Design a protein around this ligand. Structure first.
Ligand SMILES: [Ca+2]
Ligand SMILES: [Ca+2]
Ligand SMILES: [Ca+2]
Ligand SMILES: [Ca+2]
Lengths: 663, 663
């Protein structure tokens, strides 16, 4: 019944120790310098008043990234002979470019929020240690670069290019803990990664030399492997199996036996070498992962040990039973424990140890804290609505709480979901058949959204906002319910022909999202339990690595927009000779940021990727351009995708071990 | 100085026990029924006289498979309007089809050798147990099917199709011990592998239904997702990322926001589902592999304990030191051991065990045999040329043997390898520039060939053929050396303008194969030690699994030839509308067996695989045609390829664990 932050700011040393150990078991780590302070009153107060506003900081950071995502392309700022307003001419569109006034206003708001956030910690942390930390200095450097950039931009209304996007992506990276940990792992693994890159480059060079010397006199060498450089380029492309039969079709036409060589080369390359590369990364990742968790454990224990130092003023490493009983009484509130009588506890103690005045030392106290936390679940907060006692204690209210806490509500919700499936599938069937009876079924579907929002309100009322928010799936359900209700009220408030809301089809998809929870029932069977559990666990766990890949994609998009900005034009004559026009890929150019992101995603999956490389090589006229693409393939596909594969495998194995250790 | 086979056929029980424990350490397992026999004299004699001819049996098996590989296509046997002689018309060639007389003679010889091989074991094994074994029964079934097939073929000169190609591939599998074990590994996997396929099929069905209903009203669904059947077909291909931008290029043109759905689906499909499929295959492979090695270990110990039973006639589990010393005396011949004096061993025993008449029990004797072999290397056979003592004991001979066994000989050959590489690169450069000075340099390469055959003769002479053959790397060099001298003398014996041998460019590739030993020198550096060591081990270890994939291709090649034999024709009008003609893929048809193996390899590596599926679907005219390609992707690419990926990863980790425990 005591708030954790209120426990930190004021309370007995026993209350402070209980709250600190609860924080340790939660996993949150307080800043180190705050622990060193004596009772850290003002610093803790400021720290929690800062932490209370985390959502605002995260929203500001996402808005800052979307500012990059929405910025006008630089090449359009330079005067083009046809205006940049013509969307169809440059094969770009479907997002509005911010005007100068709106752009500067949005940037000023974002920069102000970022500045106040990054300079808040100086109030509580202290000047000297704040200036000591390297993270503070790099963040200050990023924010001052942003400030000078926006200042020179405002005064402008010469720079060869705009440096803001990279800086803001970097500061967005430094914002999040998980992204920082991922970068630490990557920096650890790069050292052993480069050696495998060197071996792979040596193998490619040797194979390319063999192929070039073998096919020089033949017609296929005259057609494709004209020189050693082109031979190495084609061999590197073939190593990815992007164009297997295309590169050596003339050799196969000239002589059938030649294919054997290529059959010999692809097999040893794709199956022996590539997998080996993955293996290397795999091992390294595992090792680095261990290091990280080890450090985390140490840090936790360190802060945990502070509690042992906090409870004892004389700090002689002496713990007394009459002193520890207060700690147990404090923890039984935070974590549920069986009711223990004082006489019962005394009998347990004196039968447990024959020696009089037995002492619990620091290490076993730390171990038993972990043991009691792991064995017993946490105790939920009573309520945030508890301030009104009459409504809480009302007979109908307690009957409703008893009803909802029973699983019968769960079976009722599952039955509603099944009826929802029947209704949505029949409505979609009628839509496919283009019958006129779709509207009543759509109106009935609206009632299901009403039922969902009502049940969500009931659950959040009975459990409490924090208890409801604690469950991971509950957050997704809450977001889905709120977006459904927003769409519903937007449609109902205005009886006008909207482009999207008037049709009303969208609602069905939202229901489908809410219905993914049925897949959870499939966890019941033994055959698919491990697969379903691993798939569910991956979604929150795999987020930092996907975010790192996304931010690398953003950096590469920012790089590509400047170099390949205006090359793809409708009036350009050289473009139609390239394969982009032949295959109708012009929509995936690098003209603006969203198109760059889409084409980078397409390059990421290795689906017909060499067409962009050689098309842009022909368009630019310089070989060095391919470096960009080549660099990309080295950075994200061989390293980051293999990292994702390794993480998925490790998660699956840990899930299997956890499943098997139950029996 | 005693032959192992001679030890089995005749000798003291001590010699028999020593030879049996040496066999156990080697890893070869004698047939179970022979062990039960009392001294198994005649059975062992016949068993080793059979084993002496293993090479002939393996050559017969490979010839039998190549018989299928060389057979005339069945559709050409039916009368075509243009003759099958016209190679260019049907886009087939570069291998000669056997005439009826040569075909029947070759098949008769192969079948006779197969029959005598498969019916030899009845002589020693005994009738009842031979008929008891299921492997013998299935092999008899295969051979009798082959016999009746060749008989009806000879009498013919009606069957809807020829059953011979499938049968002779199957009997090839049961021949090799390594391939038999691999199929046992697979049979356990189908239990858990089929379960995941249900989830994968369910995911495709659900995702395709969403995509079909979403885009039905839009323009893109009018073009591509015309019906749900085509929608599932198109979504399945996109799961393989074979055509990522092509499938949803009309949707992207109509509305940019449509890309969000396809980006989301590919990401959750390729990165989550595909890797989870690999994780399931990886875990089952590790589990099933443990079952195989455990059974092999149990079988080895079972035959190992027989020697303990054999040495003790009364078989009361009593081992005597004066009885045991004879075993130690015999093993020092088979495996090198430090010289032990009779009195020295006596002083060892009493201090080691205070109790008088200490007995070695049955169990630890097996464990002792394992311990001694691992720490002490095997003793090489003296020589097969030892029958001539004067040449062996010649003054020059012993000096020559001292030089080669000394390490200094190793540096000399390594120096020659470096010089050879310089000679090759300078000779190849002249060919690129087409200078007239290539011919003098080309002759110098022939001289280095004479060096390699000479050094091979010296090495085999001093070590002996069995010692030389024991090392795996020496076996590779022996074949390379012999193929050089066979080709080298062919040009010299016949001074004529050969199509290939006259040019002489073939020698450089054989020399480069021999210089691959320089890679073994790169193992010294610790940075590249793990990568190179695993790569070398994979080549012999990965053969049984790669062989299984090859045999699966042979079965599908026979199936493809019958159904798609005559579809691809130059005069065929519908063919040019297909994508094979547009992309110039006509040379990869299924017209004959040699072309079928090449095109199936292209489908194996995911390289533009969808063109073959939808070209033959239009060519055949039936939707059931895609069943052949879809079944190929599920059975081979998802299961077998992931198994290869699983094995490569597992081998790498064991290499790291083996290396780290050295320190
Ligand atoms: Ca004390
Ligand atoms: Ca509609
Ligand atoms: Ca005895
Ligand atoms: Ca030449």
């Amino acid at each position: 019944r005591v708030r954790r932050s209120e426990a930190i700011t004021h309370g007995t040393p026993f209350q402070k120790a209980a709250a600190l150990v609860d924080l340790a078991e939660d996993g949150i780590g307080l800043p180190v310098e705050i622990l060193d302070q004596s009772s850290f009153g003002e610093s803790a107060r400021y720290y929690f008043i800062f932490t209370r506003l985390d959502l605002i900081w995260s929203l500001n950071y996402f808005a800052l990234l979307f500012l990059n995502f929405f910025e006008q392309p630089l090449w359009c700022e330079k005067n083009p002979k046809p205006s940049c307003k013509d969307r169809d001419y440059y094969y770009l569109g479907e997002l509005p470019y911010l005007t100068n006034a709106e752009s500067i206003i949005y940037e000023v708001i974002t920069l102000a929020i970022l500045l106040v956030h990054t300079f808040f910690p100086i109030s509580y942390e202290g000047s000297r240690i704040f200036w000591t930390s390297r993270l503070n200095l790099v963040k200050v450097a990023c924010v001052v670069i942003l400030f000078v950039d926006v200042l020179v931009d405002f005064l402008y209304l010469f720079l060869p290019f705009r440096i803001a996007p990279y800086v803001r992506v970097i500061i967005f990276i430094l914002s999040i803990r998980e992204l920082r940990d991922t970068l630490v792992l990557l920096s650890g693994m790069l050292g052993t990664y480069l050696n495998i890159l060197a071996l792979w480059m040596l193998f490619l060079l040797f194979a390319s030399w063999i192929a070039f010397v073998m096919f020089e006199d033949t017609q296929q060498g005259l057609t494709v492997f004209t020189s050693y450089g082109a031979t190495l380029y084609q061999m590197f492309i073939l190593f990815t199996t992007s164009n297997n039969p295309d590169v050596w079709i003339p050799a196969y036409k000239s002589s059938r036996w030649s294919s054997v060589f290529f059959v010999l080369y692809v097999l040893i390359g794709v199956y022996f070498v590539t997998n080996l590369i993955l293996a290397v990364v795999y091992d390294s990742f595992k090792e680095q992962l261990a290091k990280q968790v080890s450090g985390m454990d140490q840090m936790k224990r360190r802060m945990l040990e502070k509690a042992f130092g906090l409870i004892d003023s004389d700090k002689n490493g002496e713990i007394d039973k009459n002193q520890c009983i207060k700690l147990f009484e404090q923890l039984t509130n935070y974590r549920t424990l069986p009711k223990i009588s004082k006489e019962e506890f005394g009998l347990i103690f004196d039968e447990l140890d024959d020696t009089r005045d037995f002492k619990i030392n620091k290490d076993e106290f730390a171990d038993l804290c972990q043991a009691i936390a792991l064995r017993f679940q946490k105790e939920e907060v009573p309520s945030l609505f508890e301030h009104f006692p009459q409504i809480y204690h009302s007979a109908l209210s307690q009957q409703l709480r008893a009803f909802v806490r029973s699983p019968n509500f769960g079976y009722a919700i599952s039955f509603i979901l099944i009826i929802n499936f029947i209704a949505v599938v029949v409505e979609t069937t009628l839509d496919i058949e283009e019958s006129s009876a779709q509207k009543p079924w759509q109106v009935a579907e609206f009632v299901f959204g009403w039922i969902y929002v009502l049940e969500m309100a009931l659950k959040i009322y009975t459990y409490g906002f924090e208890n409801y928010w604690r469950e991971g799936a509950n957050r997704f359900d809450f977001l889905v319910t709120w977006v459904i209700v927003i769409g519903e009220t937007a449609t109902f408030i205005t009886p006008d022909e909207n482009t999207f809301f008037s049709n009303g089809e969208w609602i069905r998809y939202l229901l489908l999202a809410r219905m993914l929870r049925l897949i959870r029932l499939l966890m019941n069977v033994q055959r698919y339990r491990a697969f379903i559990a691993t798939f569910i666990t991956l979604i929150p766990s795999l987020m930092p690595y996907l975010g790192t890949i996304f931010c690398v994609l953003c950096i590469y998009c920012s790089i590509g927009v400047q170099v390949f900005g205006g090359l793809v034009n409708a009036g350009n004559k050289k473009l139609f000779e390239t394969e982009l026009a032949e295959d109708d890929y012009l929509l995936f150019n690098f003209n603006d940021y969203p198109n760059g992101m889409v084409t980078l995603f397409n390059l990421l999956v290795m689906g017909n990727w060499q067409v962009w490389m050689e098309s842009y090589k022909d368009l630019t006229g310089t070989w060095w351009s391919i470096t960009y693409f080549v660099s990309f393939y080295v950075i994200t596909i061989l390293l980051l995708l293999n990292l994702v594969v390794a993480f998925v495998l490790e998660a699956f194995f840990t899930e299997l071990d956890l499943e098997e250790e139950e029996k």
